[PDB]
Design a protein around this ligand. Structure first.
Ligand code: FSP
Ligand code: FSP
Lengths: 215, 215
């Protein structure tokens, strides 16, 4: 694996979205990972539908949270997921309005990164592409993040509560990091992104519940 | 009165929730106590709405924290609280959207446990049911709790920063404890729970800010 990787430069990452007043971070994380594999397999980058996931993944809790793996499973068993244009994001749970006509991607399943292994996560990102990850984003320090490589001793890897997307990794000012795409809008963090400490004892639990879809 | 009590066995406790990033621990603590009394009064166990409290208890600070007593006061004055289904949790403060038709419980008052009295808290849990309590959960040792009876001399009884639910009490390997339900997801601690030292000089301030609603 390369010392650094940034899928944003390769056109594998769509613009930063804003999930609004809906606990759908898991759906944005999921579509982000799907968009990466779609681009890698078809060569086209397009926005997939997080609303499709919020409304149709029965095992998850819609605007109340959910597992990225359940989303991948849904896409697989559903034989597809709609594009954002065909199933627009509205910010609240609605009745399932999925339709094969707007299908823009499929899923053959998913894999979970060995729990707590950042080196494994690194390998996955390098070989597969953007990977869905879960972290503790409950600290005010995370909420008001502006720049630099984020590390807070108070982060709790035993309290995973937010789903985001690892689109790469590298180092800045001698500090290794993960390039994380959030879904709180472009005005949050650094243009919607946050560099999170890498190889710093699994800070914020970045490698505790990571996964990627098979396409 | 009994040596041991566990309301989870009696079906007075709903599944462990994940509060996300919103500082709503007080709301989950409040609904937990309300859920217990509702089961007792109607025989039914159901999720009540923490979002309803976050958005409508103007006396509190929404995602910035709040008092469980102010929550009970609101339910009383408001003539009710919604079920989770009728007012779903989204992990961010919204405009107050209380639905009167979705009312699932009422509150005719509440009482505050005499400050620092663990004996009184014990009697309350035994007689009333689950009780809302506040503790010092700022220690790394608390964050990474996994098993046994939690005790850390560095805990500060007068640093009440986290709201949880006491669903019982007992003794493990000779160590008296309180059975505490957190709102950091089922993967935190021991299936979302933590046993905290009981009768150990009011450890972590367990009996300094405890209260329960009446139905
Ligand atoms: C976001 O962080 C969601 C919010 C959940 C609470 C509204 N969290 C989330 O989905 O995390 C997913 C898990 C933990 C989990 C699993 C199942 C659940 F039902 C709930 C939580 C981490 C790995 C799985 C989020 O959307 N944040 C947000 C809310 C409002 N704006 N941003
Ligand atoms: C939680 O511990 C909240 C967070 C408040 C700060 C964001 N604390 C809390 O509400 O505690 C309630 C008190 C103390 C208090 C009173 C009034 C306030 F305005 C603030 C605090 C204890 C008894 C009353 C919490 O939600 N933690 C959490 C946030 C994200 N994940 N977990």
């Amino acid at each position: 694996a390369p010392d650094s990787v940034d899928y944003r430069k390769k056109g594998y990452v769509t613009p930063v979205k804003n999930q609004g007043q809906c606990g759908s971070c898991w759906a944005f994380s999921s579509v982000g990972a799907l968009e990466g594999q779609l681009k890698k397999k078809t060569g086209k980058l397009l926005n997939l539908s997080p609303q499709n996931l919020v409304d149709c993944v029965s095992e998850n809790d819609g605007c109340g949270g959910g597992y990225m793996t359940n989303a991948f499973q849904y896409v697989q068993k559903n034989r597809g997921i709609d594009s954002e244009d065909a199933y627009p994001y509205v910010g609240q749970e609605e009745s399932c309005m999925y339709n094969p006509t707007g299908k823009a991607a499929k899923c053959r399943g998913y894999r979970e990164i060995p729990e707590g292994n950042e080196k494994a996560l690194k390998r996955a990102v390098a070989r597969v592409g953007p990977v869905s990850v879960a972290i503790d984003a409950s600290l005010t320090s995370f909420q008001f993040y502006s720049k630099g490589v984020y590390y807070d001793e108070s982060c709790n890897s035993d309290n995973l509560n937010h789903a985001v997307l690892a689109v790469g990794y590298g180092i800045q000012k001698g500090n290794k990091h993960w390039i994380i795409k959030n879904s709180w809008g472009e005005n949050w963090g650094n243009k919607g992104y946050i560099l999170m400490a890498r190889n710093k004892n699994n800070a914020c639990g970045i490698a505790n519940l990571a996964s990627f879809p098979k396409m």
